[PDB]
Amino acid sequence: LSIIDVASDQNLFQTFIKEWRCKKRFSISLACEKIRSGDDTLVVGLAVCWGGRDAYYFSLGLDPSLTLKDRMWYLQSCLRKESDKECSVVIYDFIQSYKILLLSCGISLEQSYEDPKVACWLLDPDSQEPTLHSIVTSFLPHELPLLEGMETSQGIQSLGLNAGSEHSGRYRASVESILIFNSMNQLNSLLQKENLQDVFRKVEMPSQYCLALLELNGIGFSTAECESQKHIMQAKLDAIETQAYQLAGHSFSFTSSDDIAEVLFLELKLPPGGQFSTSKDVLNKLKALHPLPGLILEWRRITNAITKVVFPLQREKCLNPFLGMERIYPVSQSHTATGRITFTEPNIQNVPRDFEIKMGGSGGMPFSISMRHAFVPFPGGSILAADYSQLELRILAHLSHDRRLIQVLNTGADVFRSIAAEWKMIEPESVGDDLRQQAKQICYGIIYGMGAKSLGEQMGIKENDAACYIDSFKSRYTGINQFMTETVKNCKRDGFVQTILGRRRYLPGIKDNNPYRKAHAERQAINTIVQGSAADIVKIATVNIQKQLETFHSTFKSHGHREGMLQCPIRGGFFILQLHDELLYEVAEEDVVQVAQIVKNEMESAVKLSVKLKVKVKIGASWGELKDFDV
DNA sequence: CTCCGCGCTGCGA
DNA sequence: GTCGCAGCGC
Ligand SMILES: CN1CCN(c2cc(C(F)(F)F)cc(C(F)(F)F)c2OC(=O)N(C)c2ccc(F)cc2)C1=O
Ligand SMILES: Nc1nc2c(ncn2[C@H]2CC[C@@H](COP(=O)(O)OP(=O)(O)OP(=O)(O)O)O2)c(=O)[nH]1
Ligand SMILES: [Mg+2]
């Protein structure tokens, strides 16, 4: 290809800037390499392509008159949008590039963004995580020999951003620039064909921008809170070990399923219930007989909490010197089958719910272990959690129009406490969090295709009894099953399911021969038709909330922006985490009211349904100590 | 072979 | 290493 080193002659550089200021669409690729003496990232330059196999390299490390500050001035001049300039930038791994640009160059991009990976996921949510090699092979094969010059393109990291390759930063960035530009033109052609370009440019890419702002913010984390909770949990763990070995007369292994099987079903004559299964469903039923199953469940819960939540967060914590805080910086991921947004490194979505452990000799003492309490706002701030009240159920009500579901939605009573009251034959006010959560699983499973076998095994009852429960549900809420049958019919005639925004989940297995294959495909259809719609509504809410918060301004978009500027008082909302039906923000005090009215008004007014979207706003000094807000 | 769904992560074979 | 299993979250 033609790599044009624009920063080599002054006339060449000025003509390059002249041409660049005319373009309405161009690709961008950062050129990161190693710090000579160790190994760390260093932005050596950048690459721009606006057509053909020509990549313009903007060196940032040889006309001496082009001082680096002049180059940065022209860079910010070309990268910042103005009034109705309608520029569309194309970058691979848009969030990482935005973060690295803002943090290593002080450049806040303001143009419209187009990511090829997001387009690939939109065309097929079940597709593998797109790599530059995969995109080039599937959409721009004739230029694949370019990537044949190396093997780094086989990774999800940007080729130009991958400093590990023996190739130079310039060559990698140039190749990525041209390839991403042309492959994005092809992907845009396909998206326009399938009427999904709108959802790509108005919902998904702005959501990626909000995700980048979140990742720049990071969630605050208190280490002393984690220390205290971990000490209590380890004390209770040792107590559980000693008490269980006393109750068993010998030392078993809580991980060894055969050890506990021998202890329960043989040494203690506990009734099996094919048999000799030490699963959670069987131990929950056996808890009502001997204390040891409950102790094993508590041991497993505490061990999971302290090995898969405590230590990862304690290792992933970083100091934010400008804020005087210790924040956790997770990574976003939207490449999911149903459009939901998950997190990684660490998954602060999987933080355990609030549970209690009783310690003491005479009946113990209650000690609440809320791991979500170690997440706190900045000094003088407030965590603000806005939750969609029964989002998927309202979506199913708008779809199926089963008047019983609409009625029980209008009544305003916990349908899971209702299930548990019909289940255990108790009062709904007596249903605790554990039993209500079991009932929530029962509810959503039965709605999405739970079998009588698993329903009975979880309910602690027989198969033919859970069958009666399923038939009762189907007789009561009839429009739901009518719409489920219509959905399998539509996905069988069409071969795919379509969410509310028009996204497509391609499920060919709905016409498979194996009954399990067909059943799983039908269940995936009936699930995704609602789950992806919920994710889409959450995304629309998020992007409108961010736009509204940016309207009032007098506020830094992300934290990263404000610490980059400092190198000022905090005053505004800050995206920190997104539960799949609930948004979390970190609002400064003076705005905890205003921002709240922004989150509730947008979330309610994110999409028009036959059932109004109910939102519940809570404010607190931590994600664990949240109390309802007025708004 | 085998019957709610989406997701992550540590440990073990 | 790679993946499966089982723990948890929505
Ligand atoms: C009069 N009650 C109480 C609860 N409930 C209900 C409501 C919904 C919803 F979401 F549409 F409102 C769903 C379910 C089901 F079946 F999906 F779990 C519901 O439970 C059922 O109907 N049964 C038959 C049921 C009850 C307890 C179980 F252990 C299993 C099944 C009612 O209608
Ligand atoms: N298919 C399925 N979906 C689930 C399951 N648990 C949660 N979800 C989905 C559907 C509801 C949504 C929100 O989860 P919550 O646990 O926050 O549930 P909720 O019923 O919306 O509200 P609440 O906060 O009152 O418990 O996530 C589950 O076991 N199966
Ligand atoms: Mg909820």
Side-chain angles (χ1 to χ4, degrees), chain A residues 340 353 387-393 414 416 436-437 440-442 444-445 448 527 531 579-582:
Chain A
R340 277 163 136 216
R353 293 173 66 87
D387 160 79
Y388 272 123
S389 292
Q390 309 280 66
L391 188 60
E392 302 212 1
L393 286 142
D414 283 356
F416 319 119
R436 191 201 183 267
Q437 213 75 187
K440 203 193 321 173
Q441 296 145 49
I442 298 275
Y444 289 130
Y448 287 138
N527 156 259
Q531 171 162 233
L579 277 68
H580 304 121
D581 73 326
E582 148 173 290

Short mmCIF file of all heavy atoms in Angstrom, two decimals, chain A residues 340 353 387-393 414 416 436-437 440-442 444-445 448 527 531 579-582, chain B residues 4-6, chain C residues 9-10, ligand 2:
data_model
loop_
_atom_site.label_atom_id
_atom_site.label_comp_id
_atom_site.label_asym_id
_atom_site.label_seq_id
_atom_site.Cartn_x
_atom_site.Cartn_y
_atom_site.Cartn_z
N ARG A 340 -27.51 -7.93 25.79
CA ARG A 340 -27.18 -7.49 27.14
C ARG A 340 -25.70 -7.14 27.24
O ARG A 340 -24.88 -7.59 26.44
CB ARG A 340 -27.52 -8.58 28.16
CG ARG A 340 -28.97 -8.61 28.60
CD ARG A 340 -29.30 -9.94 29.25
NE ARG A 340 -30.08 -9.80 30.47
CZ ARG A 340 -29.94 -10.57 31.54
NH1 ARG A 340 -29.03 -11.53 31.58
NH2 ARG A 340 -30.74 -10.38 32.59
N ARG A 353 -25.24 -11.25 46.34
CA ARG A 353 -26.33 -10.55 46.99
C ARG A 353 -26.08 -10.50 48.50
O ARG A 353 -25.14 -11.10 49.04
CB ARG A 353 -27.66 -11.24 46.68
CG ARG A 353 -28.08 -11.15 45.23
CD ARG A 353 -29.31 -12.00 44.96
NE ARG A 353 -30.49 -11.51 45.66
CZ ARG A 353 -31.32 -10.59 45.18
NH1 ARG A 353 -31.12 -10.04 43.99
NH2 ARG A 353 -32.36 -10.22 45.91
N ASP A 387 -33.99 1.29 38.81
CA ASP A 387 -34.34 -0.07 38.44
C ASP A 387 -35.66 -0.10 37.68
O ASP A 387 -36.63 0.57 38.06
CB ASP A 387 -34.44 -0.96 39.68
CG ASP A 387 -35.24 -2.23 39.43
OD1 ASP A 387 -34.69 -3.18 38.84
OD2 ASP A 387 -36.42 -2.28 39.84
N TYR A 388 -35.68 -0.87 36.59
CA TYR A 388 -36.91 -1.15 35.86
C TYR A 388 -37.72 -2.19 36.62
O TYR A 388 -37.28 -3.33 36.78
CB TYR A 388 -36.59 -1.65 34.45
CG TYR A 388 -36.43 -0.57 33.41
CD1 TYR A 388 -35.26 -0.46 32.67
CD2 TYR A 388 -37.46 0.32 33.14
CE1 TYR A 388 -35.11 0.52 31.71
CE2 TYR A 388 -37.32 1.31 32.18
CZ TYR A 388 -36.15 1.40 31.47
OH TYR A 388 -36.00 2.38 30.51
N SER A 389 -38.91 -1.80 37.08
CA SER A 389 -39.78 -2.70 37.82
C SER A 389 -40.44 -3.67 36.85
O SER A 389 -41.35 -3.29 36.11
CB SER A 389 -40.82 -1.92 38.62
OG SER A 389 -40.21 -1.19 39.66
N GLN A 390 -39.97 -4.92 36.84
CA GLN A 390 -40.56 -6.00 36.05
C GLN A 390 -40.50 -5.67 34.55
O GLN A 390 -41.52 -5.58 33.87
CB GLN A 390 -41.99 -6.28 36.50
CG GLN A 390 -42.14 -6.49 38.00
CD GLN A 390 -41.74 -7.89 38.44
OE1 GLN A 390 -40.58 -8.28 38.35
NE2 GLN A 390 -42.71 -8.65 38.94
N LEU A 391 -39.27 -5.50 34.06
CA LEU A 391 -39.08 -5.08 32.67
C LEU A 391 -39.49 -6.16 31.69
O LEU A 391 -40.33 -5.94 30.81
CB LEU A 391 -37.61 -4.68 32.46
CG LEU A 391 -37.27 -4.04 31.12
CD1 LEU A 391 -38.04 -2.75 30.92
CD2 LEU A 391 -35.77 -3.79 31.02
N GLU A 392 -38.91 -7.36 31.82
CA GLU A 392 -39.23 -8.44 30.90
C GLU A 392 -40.70 -8.83 30.97
O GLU A 392 -41.30 -9.18 29.95
CB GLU A 392 -38.33 -9.65 31.19
CG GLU A 392 -36.84 -9.35 31.09
CD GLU A 392 -36.04 -10.54 30.61
OE1 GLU A 392 -36.64 -11.60 30.34
OE2 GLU A 392 -34.80 -10.42 30.51
N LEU A 393 -41.30 -8.76 32.16
CA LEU A 393 -42.71 -9.08 32.28
C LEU A 393 -43.58 -8.05 31.58
O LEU A 393 -44.58 -8.40 30.94
CB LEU A 393 -43.10 -9.21 33.75
CG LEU A 393 -42.59 -10.49 34.43
CD1 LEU A 393 -42.16 -10.21 35.87
CD2 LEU A 393 -43.64 -11.58 34.39
N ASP A 414 -45.85 -8.57 44.43
CA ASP A 414 -44.76 -9.45 44.01
C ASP A 414 -45.29 -10.79 43.51
O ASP A 414 -45.79 -11.60 44.30
CB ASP A 414 -43.77 -9.67 45.16
CG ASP A 414 -42.85 -8.49 45.37
OD1 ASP A 414 -42.93 -7.53 44.58
OD2 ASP A 414 -42.06 -8.53 46.33
N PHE A 416 -43.53 -13.17 42.55
CA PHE A 416 -42.68 -14.23 43.08
C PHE A 416 -43.06 -14.57 44.51
O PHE A 416 -43.09 -15.75 44.88
CB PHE A 416 -41.21 -13.82 42.97
CG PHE A 416 -40.88 -13.13 41.68
CD1 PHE A 416 -40.39 -11.83 41.68
CD2 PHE A 416 -41.06 -13.78 40.47
CE1 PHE A 416 -40.09 -11.20 40.49
CE2 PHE A 416 -40.76 -13.15 39.28
CZ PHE A 416 -40.27 -11.86 39.29
N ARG A 436 -38.16 -16.03 47.86
CA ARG A 436 -38.62 -15.20 46.75
C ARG A 436 -37.70 -15.32 45.54
O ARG A 436 -38.17 -15.25 44.40
CB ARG A 436 -38.73 -13.74 47.19
CG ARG A 436 -39.45 -12.83 46.20
CD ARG A 436 -39.07 -11.37 46.43
NE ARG A 436 -39.79 -10.47 45.55
CZ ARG A 436 -39.34 -10.04 44.38
NH1 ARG A 436 -38.15 -10.42 43.92
NH2 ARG A 436 -40.08 -9.22 43.65
N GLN A 437 -36.40 -15.54 45.76
CA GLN A 437 -35.48 -15.71 44.64
C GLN A 437 -35.67 -17.07 43.98
O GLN A 437 -35.65 -17.18 42.75
CB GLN A 437 -34.04 -15.53 45.12
CG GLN A 437 -33.10 -14.90 44.09
CD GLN A 437 -33.31 -13.40 43.93
OE1 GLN A 437 -32.72 -12.78 43.05
NE2 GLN A 437 -34.14 -12.82 44.79
N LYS A 440 -38.61 -16.60 41.92
CA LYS A 440 -38.30 -15.87 40.70
C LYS A 440 -37.72 -16.81 39.64
O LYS A 440 -38.09 -16.73 38.46
CB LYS A 440 -37.32 -14.73 40.99
CG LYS A 440 -37.36 -13.61 39.97
CD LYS A 440 -36.18 -12.66 40.10
CE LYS A 440 -35.82 -12.38 41.55
NZ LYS A 440 -34.57 -11.58 41.65
N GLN A 441 -36.80 -17.68 40.05
CA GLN A 441 -36.29 -18.69 39.12
C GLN A 441 -37.42 -19.57 38.60
O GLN A 441 -37.51 -19.84 37.40
CB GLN A 441 -35.22 -19.55 39.80
CG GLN A 441 -33.96 -18.80 40.20
CD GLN A 441 -33.36 -19.32 41.48
OE1 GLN A 441 -33.17 -20.53 41.65
NE2 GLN A 441 -33.05 -18.42 42.41
N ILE A 442 -38.31 -20.01 39.50
CA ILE A 442 -39.46 -20.82 39.11
C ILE A 442 -40.29 -20.09 38.06
O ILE A 442 -40.66 -20.65 37.03
CB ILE A 442 -40.30 -21.19 40.34
CG1 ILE A 442 -39.48 -22.02 41.34
CG2 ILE A 442 -41.57 -21.92 39.94
CD1 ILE A 442 -39.46 -23.49 41.06
N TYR A 444 -39.58 -17.39 35.96
CA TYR A 444 -38.98 -17.17 34.65
C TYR A 444 -38.70 -18.48 33.92
O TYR A 444 -38.82 -18.54 32.69
CB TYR A 444 -37.71 -16.32 34.78
CG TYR A 444 -38.00 -14.88 35.14
CD1 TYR A 444 -37.34 -14.25 36.19
CD2 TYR A 444 -38.92 -14.14 34.41
CE1 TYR A 444 -37.60 -12.93 36.51
CE2 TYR A 444 -39.19 -12.82 34.73
CZ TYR A 444 -38.53 -12.22 35.78
OH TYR A 444 -38.79 -10.90 36.09
N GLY A 445 -38.37 -19.54 34.66
CA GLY A 445 -38.18 -20.83 34.01
C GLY A 445 -39.46 -21.37 33.41
O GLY A 445 -39.49 -21.79 32.25
N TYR A 448 -40.29 -19.51 30.35
CA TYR A 448 -39.38 -19.70 29.23
C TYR A 448 -39.22 -21.16 28.81
O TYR A 448 -38.45 -21.44 27.88
CB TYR A 448 -38.01 -19.10 29.56
CG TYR A 448 -38.01 -17.59 29.54
CD1 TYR A 448 -37.34 -16.87 30.52
CD2 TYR A 448 -38.68 -16.89 28.54
CE1 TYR A 448 -37.34 -15.49 30.50
CE2 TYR A 448 -38.68 -15.51 28.52
CZ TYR A 448 -38.01 -14.81 29.51
OH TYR A 448 -38.00 -13.44 29.49
N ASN A 527 -37.06 -16.88 24.64
CA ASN A 527 -36.32 -16.09 25.61
C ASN A 527 -35.78 -14.81 24.99
O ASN A 527 -35.98 -13.72 25.54
CB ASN A 527 -35.17 -16.90 26.20
CG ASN A 527 -34.06 -16.02 26.73
OD1 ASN A 527 -33.03 -15.83 26.08
ND2 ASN A 527 -34.27 -15.47 27.92
N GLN A 531 -35.68 -10.90 26.14
CA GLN A 531 -34.45 -10.50 26.80
C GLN A 531 -33.69 -9.47 25.97
O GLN A 531 -33.19 -8.47 26.51
CB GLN A 531 -33.58 -11.73 27.07
CG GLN A 531 -32.17 -11.44 27.55
CD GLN A 531 -31.53 -12.65 28.21
OE1 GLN A 531 -31.04 -12.57 29.34
NE2 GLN A 531 -31.53 -13.77 27.51
N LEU A 579 -26.54 -2.97 35.59
CA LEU A 579 -27.23 -4.24 35.71
C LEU A 579 -28.24 -4.38 34.57
O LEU A 579 -28.70 -3.39 33.99
CB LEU A 579 -27.93 -4.36 37.06
CG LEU A 579 -27.08 -4.82 38.25
CD1 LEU A 579 -26.03 -3.78 38.64
CD2 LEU A 579 -27.97 -5.16 39.44
N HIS A 580 -28.59 -5.62 34.26
CA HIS A 580 -29.33 -5.90 33.03
C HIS A 580 -30.73 -5.29 33.03
O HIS A 580 -31.36 -5.23 31.97
CB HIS A 580 -29.39 -7.40 32.81
CG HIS A 580 -28.04 -8.05 32.77
ND1 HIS A 580 -27.66 -9.04 33.65
CD2 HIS A 580 -26.97 -7.83 31.98
CE1 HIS A 580 -26.42 -9.41 33.39
NE2 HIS A 580 -25.98 -8.69 32.38
N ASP A 581 -31.23 -4.84 34.18
CA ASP A 581 -32.49 -4.10 34.21
C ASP A 581 -32.41 -2.90 35.15
O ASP A 581 -33.45 -2.39 35.58
CB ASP A 581 -33.65 -5.01 34.62
CG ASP A 581 -33.63 -5.39 36.09
OD1 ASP A 581 -32.52 -5.54 36.65
OD2 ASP A 581 -34.72 -5.54 36.68
N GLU A 582 -31.20 -2.43 35.47
CA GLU A 582 -31.01 -1.39 36.47
C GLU A 582 -29.71 -0.66 36.19
O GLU A 582 -28.68 -1.30 35.93
CB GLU A 582 -31.01 -2.01 37.88
CG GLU A 582 -30.13 -1.30 38.89
CD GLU A 582 -30.30 -1.87 40.29
OE1 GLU A 582 -31.38 -1.65 40.89
OE2 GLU A 582 -29.37 -2.53 40.79
P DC B 4 -35.36 -27.83 31.81
OP1 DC B 4 -33.97 -28.01 32.28
OP2 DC B 4 -36.48 -28.45 32.56
"O5'" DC B 4 -35.66 -26.26 31.67
"C5'" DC B 4 -34.67 -25.40 31.13
"C4'" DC B 4 -35.31 -24.27 30.34
"O4'" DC B 4 -36.21 -23.53 31.20
"C3'" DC B 4 -34.33 -23.25 29.78
"O3'" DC B 4 -33.94 -23.63 28.47
"C2'" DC B 4 -35.16 -21.97 29.77
"C1'" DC B 4 -36.02 -22.13 31.02
N1 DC B 4 -35.40 -21.57 32.27
C2 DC B 4 -35.21 -20.18 32.39
O2 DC B 4 -35.54 -19.44 31.46
N3 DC B 4 -34.66 -19.70 33.53
C4 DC B 4 -34.32 -20.53 34.52
N4 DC B 4 -33.78 -20.00 35.62
C5 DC B 4 -34.51 -21.93 34.41
C6 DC B 4 -35.05 -22.41 33.29
P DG B 5 -32.44 -23.36 27.96
OP1 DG B 5 -32.39 -23.82 26.56
OP2 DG B 5 -31.50 -23.92 28.96
"O5'" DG B 5 -32.29 -21.76 27.99
"C5'" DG B 5 -32.97 -20.97 27.03
"C4'" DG B 5 -32.81 -19.49 27.34
"O4'" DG B 5 -33.31 -19.22 28.67
"C3'" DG B 5 -31.39 -18.98 27.37
"O3'" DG B 5 -30.95 -18.68 26.05
"C2'" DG B 5 -31.53 -17.71 28.20
"C1'" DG B 5 -32.65 -18.07 29.18
N9 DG B 5 -32.17 -18.35 30.53
C8 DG B 5 -32.09 -19.57 31.15
N7 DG B 5 -31.60 -19.50 32.36
C5 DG B 5 -31.35 -18.15 32.55
C6 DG B 5 -30.81 -17.46 33.67
O6 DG B 5 -30.45 -17.93 34.76
N1 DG B 5 -30.72 -16.09 33.44
C2 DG B 5 -31.09 -15.46 32.28
N2 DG B 5 -30.92 -14.13 32.23
N3 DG B 5 -31.59 -16.09 31.22
C4 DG B 5 -31.69 -17.43 31.43
P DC B 6 -29.38 -18.69 25.70
OP1 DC B 6 -29.26 -18.47 24.24
OP2 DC B 6 -28.78 -19.90 26.31
"O5'" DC B 6 -28.80 -17.41 26.47
"C5'" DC B 6 -28.85 -16.14 25.85
"C4'" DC B 6 -28.40 -15.03 26.79
"O4'" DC B 6 -29.14 -15.08 28.03
"C3'" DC B 6 -26.96 -15.08 27.24
"O3'" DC B 6 -26.09 -14.62 26.22
"C2'" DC B 6 -27.01 -14.11 28.41
"C1'" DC B 6 -28.34 -14.51 29.06
N1 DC B 6 -28.16 -15.50 30.15
C2 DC B 6 -27.66 -15.08 31.39
O2 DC B 6 -27.39 -13.88 31.55
N3 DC B 6 -27.49 -16.00 32.38
C4 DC B 6 -27.79 -17.28 32.16
N4 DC B 6 -27.61 -18.15 33.15
C5 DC B 6 -28.30 -17.73 30.90
C6 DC B 6 -28.46 -16.81 29.94
P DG C 9 -26.13 -14.56 43.97
OP1 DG C 9 -26.32 -13.73 45.18
OP2 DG C 9 -27.06 -15.67 43.69
"O5'" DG C 9 -26.08 -13.63 42.68
"C5'" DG C 9 -25.32 -12.42 42.69
"C4'" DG C 9 -25.31 -11.76 41.32
"O4'" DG C 9 -24.60 -12.59 40.38
"C3'" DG C 9 -26.67 -11.56 40.69
"O3'" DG C 9 -27.28 -10.38 41.20
"C2'" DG C 9 -26.30 -11.40 39.22
"C1'" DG C 9 -25.15 -12.40 39.08
N9 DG C 9 -25.57 -13.69 38.54
C8 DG C 9 -25.64 -14.88 39.22
N7 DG C 9 -26.05 -15.88 38.48
C5 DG C 9 -26.26 -15.31 37.23
C6 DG C 9 -26.71 -15.90 36.02
O6 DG C 9 -27.01 -17.08 35.82
N1 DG C 9 -26.79 -14.97 34.99
C2 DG C 9 -26.48 -13.63 35.11
N2 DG C 9 -26.62 -12.88 34.01
N3 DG C 9 -26.06 -13.07 36.24
C4 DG C 9 -25.97 -13.96 37.25
P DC C 10 -28.88 -10.23 41.18
OP1 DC C 10 -29.23 -9.02 41.97
OP2 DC C 10 -29.45 -11.55 41.55
"O5'" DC C 10 -29.24 -9.96 39.65
"C5'" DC C 10 -28.81 -8.76 39.02
"C4'" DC C 10 -28.76 -8.93 37.51
"O4'" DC C 10 -28.40 -10.30 37.19
"C3'" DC C 10 -30.08 -8.65 36.79
"C2'" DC C 10 -30.60 -10.04 36.46
"C1'" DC C 10 -29.32 -10.82 36.25
N1 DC C 10 -29.46 -12.28 36.50
C2 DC C 10 -29.92 -13.10 35.46
O2 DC C 10 -30.19 -12.60 34.37
N3 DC C 10 -30.05 -14.44 35.70
C4 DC C 10 -29.75 -14.93 36.90
N4 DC C 10 -29.89 -16.25 37.09
C5 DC C 10 -29.29 -14.10 37.96
C6 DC C 10 -29.16 -12.79 37.72
N1 LIG D 2 -34.64 -16.58 32.15
C1 LIG D 2 -34.23 -15.96 33.38
N2 LIG D 2 -34.19 -14.62 33.41
C2 LIG D 2 -33.78 -14.15 34.66
C3 LIG D 2 -33.43 -14.93 35.77
N3 LIG D 2 -33.07 -14.12 36.85
C4 LIG D 2 -33.19 -12.84 36.39
N4 LIG D 2 -33.63 -12.83 35.03
C5 LIG D 2 -33.90 -11.70 34.12
C6 LIG D 2 -35.42 -11.49 33.97
C7 LIG D 2 -35.67 -10.40 34.99
C8 LIG D 2 -34.36 -9.62 34.99
C9 LIG D 2 -34.02 -8.92 36.32
O1 LIG D 2 -33.57 -9.81 37.22
P1 LIG D 2 -33.89 -9.44 38.98
O2 LIG D 2 -33.17 -10.60 39.59
O3 LIG D 2 -33.27 -8.07 39.01
O4 LIG D 2 -35.42 -9.52 38.78
P2 LIG D 2 -36.92 -8.70 38.72
O5 LIG D 2 -37.88 -9.85 38.65
O6 LIG D 2 -36.88 -7.88 37.45
O7 LIG D 2 -36.91 -7.81 39.97
P3 LIG D 2 -36.49 -7.64 41.66
O8 LIG D 2 -35.38 -6.61 41.59
O9 LIG D 2 -37.80 -7.22 42.29
O10 LIG D 2 -36.04 -9.03 42.07
O11 LIG D 2 -33.34 -10.55 34.66
C10 LIG D 2 -33.48 -16.37 35.72
O12 LIG D 2 -33.23 -17.22 36.54
N5 LIG D 2 -33.91 -16.81 34.43
#
